[PDB]
Amino acid sequence: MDDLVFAGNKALYLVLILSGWPTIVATIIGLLVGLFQTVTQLQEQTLPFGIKLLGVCLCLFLLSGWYGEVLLSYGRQVIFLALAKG
């Protein structure tokens, strides 16, 4: 039982960790560009998209490795919990 609760909790915890950094940078870029467009009055609306695409892709390059190490370790763990009973 507690193994079930633990594994289910951890799933949500990993979602949170992995998704957190891209969504942070997409937020910060959204705020900065929105402010800049009030500091100098320009009514463009694709500029956020153009910048935040580069912003998100860059950090996907950076974190490409840790993403695979975390998921491998988790998969091995849950396969053990499922099968290794005696």
């Binding site: 039982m1 507690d2 193994d3 633990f6």
Partner: protein
């Protein structure tokens, strides 16, 4: 006079004075308020006072309790932290109850934390306890261990007399006469 220590707490100063006096060293306690207490001795006694401060590793460190590692002011708690706080409060409440028995001066208690695991999928292990106590002079220690064991046994869901360790000791000789002043 030479300065030994500065910025002490009240509870650190009185313990230092007690240990110096026991070895016949006359010491002086001075209060500087926001700067705390200072302790001074005469030159003929300076060497000895230094050697005893080293031997007892004074001033004393503050008392440690497990609840301090998991402050209740957190915004999140795991089951593990909650369970730890629980046991870290039962231990203290038992020590405080034992000090009320007949002629006990002070005591200490320890509980086996299973909390470091969930005992996941396993029948959870039984509890173990340990206690130390200091009695007044002329106490029949042998006859008093039974009472303590009896009292502890029923404080928990499953405890065996075999799993309870109790160690007792008598108070040392009283330090009543004052130390002599250096000539």
């Amino acid at each position: 006079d030479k300065d030994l220590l500065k910025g002490l707490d009240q509870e650190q100063a009185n313990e230092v004075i007690a240990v110096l006096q026991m070895h016949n060293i006359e010491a002086n306690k001075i209060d500087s308020g926001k700067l705390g207490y200072s302790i001074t001795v005469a030159e003929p006694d300076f060497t000895a006072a230094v050697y005893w401060i080293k031997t007892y590793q004074l001033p004393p460190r503050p008392r440690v309790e497990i609840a301090q590692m998991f402050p209740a002011d957190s915004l999140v708690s795991s089951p593990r932290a909650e369970k730890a706080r629980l046991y870290s409060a039962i231990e203290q409440r038992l020590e405080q109850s034992l000090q009320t028995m007949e002629g006990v001066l002070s005591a200490r208690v320890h509980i086996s934390y299973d909390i470091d695991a969930g005992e996941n999928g396993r029948p959870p292990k039984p509890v173990h306890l340990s206690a130390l106590a200091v009695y007044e002079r002329g106490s029949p220690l042998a006859h008093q261990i039974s009472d303590i064991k009896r009292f502890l046994k029923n404080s928990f869901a499953d405890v065996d007399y075999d799993n309870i360790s109790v160690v007792l000791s008598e108070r040392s000789d009283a330090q009543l006469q004052a130390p002599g002043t250096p000539v």
